[PDB]
Amino acid sequence: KEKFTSLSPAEFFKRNPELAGFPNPARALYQTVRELIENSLDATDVHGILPNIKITIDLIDDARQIYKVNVVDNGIGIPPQEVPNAFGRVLYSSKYVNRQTRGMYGLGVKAAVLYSQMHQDKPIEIETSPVNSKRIYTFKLKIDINKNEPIIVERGSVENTRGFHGTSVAISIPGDWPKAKSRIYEYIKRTYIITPYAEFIFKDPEGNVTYYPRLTNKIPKPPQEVKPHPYGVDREEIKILINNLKRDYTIKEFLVNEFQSIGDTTADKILELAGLKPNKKVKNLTEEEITRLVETFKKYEDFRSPSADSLSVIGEDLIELGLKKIFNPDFAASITRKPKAYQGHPFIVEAGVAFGGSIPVGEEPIVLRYANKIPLIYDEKSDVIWKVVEELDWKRYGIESDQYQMVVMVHLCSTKIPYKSAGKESIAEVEDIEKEIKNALMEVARKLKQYLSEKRKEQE
Amino acid sequence: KEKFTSLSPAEFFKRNPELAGFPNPARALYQTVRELIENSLDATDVHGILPNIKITIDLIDDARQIYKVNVVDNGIGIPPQEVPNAFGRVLYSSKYVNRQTRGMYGLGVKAAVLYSQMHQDKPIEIETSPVNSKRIYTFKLKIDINKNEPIIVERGSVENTRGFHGTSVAISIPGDWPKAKSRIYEYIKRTYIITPYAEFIFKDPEGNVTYYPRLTNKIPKPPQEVKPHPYGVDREEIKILINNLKRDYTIKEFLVNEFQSIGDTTADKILELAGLKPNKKVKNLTEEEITRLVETFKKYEDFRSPSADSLSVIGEDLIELGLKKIFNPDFAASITRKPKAYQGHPFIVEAGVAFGGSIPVGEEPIVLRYANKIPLIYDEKSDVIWKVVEELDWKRYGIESDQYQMVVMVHLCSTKIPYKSAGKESIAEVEDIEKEIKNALMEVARKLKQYLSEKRKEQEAKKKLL
Ligand SMILES: Nc1ncnc2c1ncn2[C@@H]1O[C@H](COP(=O)(O)OP(=O)(O)O)[C@@H](O)[C@H]1O
Ligand SMILES: Nc1ncnc2c1ncn2[C@@H]1O[C@H](COP(=O)(O)OP(=O)(O)O)[C@@H](O)[C@H]1O
Numbered sequence: 001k002e003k004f005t006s007l008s009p010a011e012f013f014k015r016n017p018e019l020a021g022f023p024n025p026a027r028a029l030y031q032t033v034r035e036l037i038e039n040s041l042d043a044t045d046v047h048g049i050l051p052n053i054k055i056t057i058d059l060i061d062d063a064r065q066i067y068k069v070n071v072v073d074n075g076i077g078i079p080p081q082e083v084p085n086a087f088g089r090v091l092y093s094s095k096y097v098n099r100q101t102r103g104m105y106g107l108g109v110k111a112a113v114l115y116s117q118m119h120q121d122k123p124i125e126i127e128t129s130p131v132n133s134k135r136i137y138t139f140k141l142k143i144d145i146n147k148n149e150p151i152i153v154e155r156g157s158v159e160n161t162r163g164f165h166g167t168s169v170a171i172s173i174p175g176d177w178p179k180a181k182s183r184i185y186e187y188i189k190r191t192y193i194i195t196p197y198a199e200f201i202f203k204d205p206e207g208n209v210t211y212y213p214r215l216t217n218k219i220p221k222p223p224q225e226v227k228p229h230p231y232g233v234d235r236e237e238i239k240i241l242i243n244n245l246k247r248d249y250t251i252k253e254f255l256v257n258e259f260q261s262i263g264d265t266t267a268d269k270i271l272e273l274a275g276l277k278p279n280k281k282v283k284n285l286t287e288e289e290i291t292r293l294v295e296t297f298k299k300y301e302d303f304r305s306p307s308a309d310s311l312s313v314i315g316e317d318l319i320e321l322g323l324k325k326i327f328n329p330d331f332a333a334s335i336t337r338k339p340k341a342y343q344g345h346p347f348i349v350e351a352g353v354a355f356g357g358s359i360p361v362g363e364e365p366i367v368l369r370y371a372n373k374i375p376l377i378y379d380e381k382s383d384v385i386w387k388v389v390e391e392l393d394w395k396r397y398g399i400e401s402d403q404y405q406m407v408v409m410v411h412l413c414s415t416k417i418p419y420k421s422a423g424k425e426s427i428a429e430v431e432d433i434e435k436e437i438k439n440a441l442m443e444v445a446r447k448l449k450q451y452l453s454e455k456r457k458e459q460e
Numbered sequence: 461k462e463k464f465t466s467l468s469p470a471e472f473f474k475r476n477p478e479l480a481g482f483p484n485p486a487r488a489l490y491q492t493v494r495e496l497i498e499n500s501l502d503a504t505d506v507h508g509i510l511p512n513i514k515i516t517i518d519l520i521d522d523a524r525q526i527y528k529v530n531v532v533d534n535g536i537g538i539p540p541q542e543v544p545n546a547f548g549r550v551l552y553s554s555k556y557v558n559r560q561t562r563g564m565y566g567l568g569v570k571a572a573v574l575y576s577q578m579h580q581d582k583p584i585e586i587e588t589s590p591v592n593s594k595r596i597y598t599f600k601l602k603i604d605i606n607k608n609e610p611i612i613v614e615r616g617s618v619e620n621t622r623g624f625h626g627t628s629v630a631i632s633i634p635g636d637w638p639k640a641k642s643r644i645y646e647y648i649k650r651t652y653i654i655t656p657y658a659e660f661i662f663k664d665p666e667g668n669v670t671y672y673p674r675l676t677n678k679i680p681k682p683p684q685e686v687k688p689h690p691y692g693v694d695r696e697e698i699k700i701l702i703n704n705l706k707r708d709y710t711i712k713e714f715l716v717n718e719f720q721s722i723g724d725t726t727a728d729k730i731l732e733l734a735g736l737k738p739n740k741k742v743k744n745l746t747e748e749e750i751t752r753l754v755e756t757f758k759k760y761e762d763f764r765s766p767s768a769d770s771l772s773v774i775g776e777d778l779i780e781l782g783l784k785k786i787f788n789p790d791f792a793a794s795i796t797r798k799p800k801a802y803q804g805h806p807f808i809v810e811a812g813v814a815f816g817g818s819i820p821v822g823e824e825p826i827v828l829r830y831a832n833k834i835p836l837i838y839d840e841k842s843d844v845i846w847k848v849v850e851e852l853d854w855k856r857y858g859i860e861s862d863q864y865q866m867v868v869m870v871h872l873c874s875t876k877i878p879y880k881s882a883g884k885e886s887i888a889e890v891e892d893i894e895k896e897i898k899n900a901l902m903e904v905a906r907k908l909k910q911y912l913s914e915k916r917k918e919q920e921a922k923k924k925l926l
């Protein structure tokens with residue numbers, strides 16, 4: 001009766017597509033679109049390239065409701081040896097490195113490929129040309145779910161005359177355009193508003209074409225790989241850090257070199273609290289001494305914040321400008337908080353508030369959520385951002401009536417966003433994140449008070 | 461600058477524990493408790509055994525806030541050779557078959573084990589004796605994250621002089637008792653109310669003990685493994701089915717032998733609609749033919765409903781009894797609907813309504829969600845159940861004011877529950893399930909409508925006397 005069996009990562013997601021954001025054809029179409037766009041953006045702005053991204057969705061089969069999604073970008077491309085695994089091996093990524101990107105699981109595109117395979121028979125099509133490559137490399141791929149490995153259906157190359165570079169991805173999937181339409185449009189519009197150095201073109205299944213022109217040629221400094229912040233690094237992470245050392249570091253040397261925010265004196269203070277010999281060889285840490293390091297990191301109250309430069313923010317100015325373009329308010333304000341850390345990861349919370357003007361009258365605020373520059377559209381009431389907004393008492397900040405015109409926007413960015421599911425539509429209840437979102441909203445809420453106070457004496 | 465790497469299933473969950481319901485210490489404590497409890501129930505009532513479950517949570521270290529969770533059951537135990545993979549290999553399960561169980565990913569207990577070693581240094585402790593085994597096998601285990609394999613730290617054996625069968629699992633993890641407390645108690649109380657054939661004992665970190673006595677000695681008929689129903693079976697699944705074949709079946713034989721609700725006549729019609737040659741050997745099906753089968757499965761309107769043999773319901777009588785006991789309403793009603801299918805999986809929705817009486821007054825219903833007899837506690841407003849309850853027009857069913865006292869209960873059971881996350885706290889928006897939940901709710905709301913029309917009519921008669 002009990003037969004014990006194993007699954008591959010590919011079989012796991014094929015059996016549970018709702019875990020990756022593929023619960024139904026409408027959400028699947030939306031998910032496939034944003035995974036491709038986010039890959040294209042990670043392939044451009046992370047590498048100092050002004051993104052030029054084209055999105056096409058065609059209805060291929062009316063009766064069967066199969067759509068072909070094609071995204072083309074001018075990004076860094078993919079080395080041809082890596083393409084099969086990049087697109088056809090679940091849990092394969094170039095972004096497992098400690099660095100702020102949109103992608104993070106090494107699942108995304110493969111979830112769409114699995115969903116594609118589940119329901120129709122055309123392979124995914126990849127065309128790619130790395131910087132300086134004299135060839136465009138072409139592929140048609142499927143995934144062997146049992147082995148979790150790519151099946152190469154076609155593989156070829158052509159000479160690249162108009163010597164340009166980037167990647168085109170096309171995937172055919174079940175979809176529901178009429179149901180996904182408003183959200184696909186909103187996803188692209190919100191991305192665009194916060195990514196003014198990007199240019200998008202969107203051709204939809206009805207044949208509408210929408211142009212989103214570049215507004216500036218200045219890209220924010222690209223996020224880089226950074227060292228972990230000590231606060232919240234766990235025991236398994238300590239072991240990984242040790243196992244990856246080239247040099248025979250002592251524990252002291254380990255602390256100042258492998259982490260952010262640890263100078264020579266901070267190192268000493270930690271080693272004392274943790275009860276570790278500074279000169280002992282870190283390769284020799286016992287199971288117990290690792291426990292003592294981790295607990296010390298967790299308790300130490302005098303850690304400097306991580307470098308803000310670790311991350312890529314939207315910015316106070318862009319945030320306020322955005323709130324004025326869309327909402328045409330009587331008042332807006334924003335803050336880009338100083339960095340904090342959670343589980344070894346630097347993060348910044350930004351928050352913005354708008355009030356009055358063309359903002360609809362309602363019983364709750366309109367809440368706008370972003371994480372690593374991605375607009376979140378689904379599952380809003382499950383989000384920690386919504387929880388904090390809900391729990392805050394807006395009467396303590398001027399909100400007189402139970403009916404008001406208010407927009408609240410929160411952006412979380414980090415080397416790691418803790419999402420509730422691999423679908424990445426909502427942020428989990430991580431304690432340090434929840435507290436800082438609350439502190440951030442309070443700062444901007446105080447500014448709203450100062451206005452609603454001055455504005456009240458006018459009616460008085 | 462880009463370096464490509466892979467992760468094992470263990471490293472995946474270790475890097476992202478929030479995906480398996482381990483976002484913070486409070487929720488970790490709650491998740492660990494509920495994973496152990498569900499495994500214990502799956503080891504007992506799935507095999508016809510009346511569950512006796514003991515849960516203890518001890519505070520081991522006040523400063524580090526480490527708690528040791530221990531759950532002991534009288535289940536079937538585990539063959540000693542399977543113990544290391546069962547607790548220490550991510551994506552390893554005895555329940556990847558077509559049968560209703562609480563467990564479903566082969567993740568749960570390992571996610572607790574990972575959280576355990578990420579934060580403290582004591583191995584998890586397993587003690588087990590299978591049915592009829594002369595021995596009690598003990599294990600201490602860790603996981604090698606990189607390889608996704610068990611490390612046997614200690615392994616031992618002892619003579620089972622008392623004929624005991626079952627398992628004890630004990631795991632030390634960071635926790636937060638004061639924040640997790642009310643939900644852990646509510647989880648246990650909720651499961652007990654719908655599992656009256658079980659007995660629980662719960663000792664909490666404060667040294668409080670609660671006893672939940674068995675109220676009936678009848679066990680529901682255990683769910684059995686069944687063949688897939690054709691409706692919604694996808695292409696990869698068709699391939700899996702073909703590949704597991706030990707015979708050289710024709711397509712016709714494949715259809716009649718591999719599925720529920722297909723006999724000779726239904727097969728003939730399916731072969732006709734799909735444009736498939738009945739005599740062709742199914743091992744030779746082309747990619748395009750598989751697509752045709754699948755679409756035909758998807759559009760065929762004459763399939764018989766699946767049996768409920770693979771399912772285990774709470775049942776109308778118990779739903780109503782439980783609603784009355786807890787809420788002391790003026791009215792309650794319930795419905796256990798007929799089975800349907802989605803994605804090849806038989807499913808049943810049960811619904812319950814309670815109104816008035818001891819129910820608190822509020823602006824919205826109290827919603828009680830269950831999946832495969834597990835009470836769902838967190839993330840309620842993301843649940844498809846919430847979505848359906850919220851969109852229903854309660855004025856159409858006699859709910860006059862903006863304020864009322866109502867409880868609504870929905871249980872989905874199936875060989876596969878589509879949760880939104882591996883933490884299994886909310887059900888995703890799958891169309892077939894959404895429609896049937898709406899249907900069930902409407903059937904139970906019509907019963908409420910009737911109660912309230914009765915009350916109104918009497919008031920109207922009484923108004924004339926004024
Ligand atoms: N358009 C693209 N341009 C360059 N690289 C890409 C592109 N699309 C996908 N990739 C590569 O494929 C890998 C796997 O992508 P994905 O499955 O979506 O996971 P993730 O984005 O989380 O790493 C990425 O890490 C990236 O290296
Ligand atoms: N208390 C128990 N009694 C019997 N078997 C157990 C017990 N706990 C765990 N198992 C076995 O270990 C396997 C892995 O459990 P778990 O990681 O929770 O995944 P899942 O429950 O989805 O199968 C189970 O399928 C079950 O066979």
Ligand SMILES: [Mg+2]
Pocket residue numbers: 035038039102103104108109
């Ligand atoms: Mg991606």
Ligand SMILES: [Mg+2]
Pocket residue numbers: 495498499562563564568569
């Ligand atoms: Mg389980």
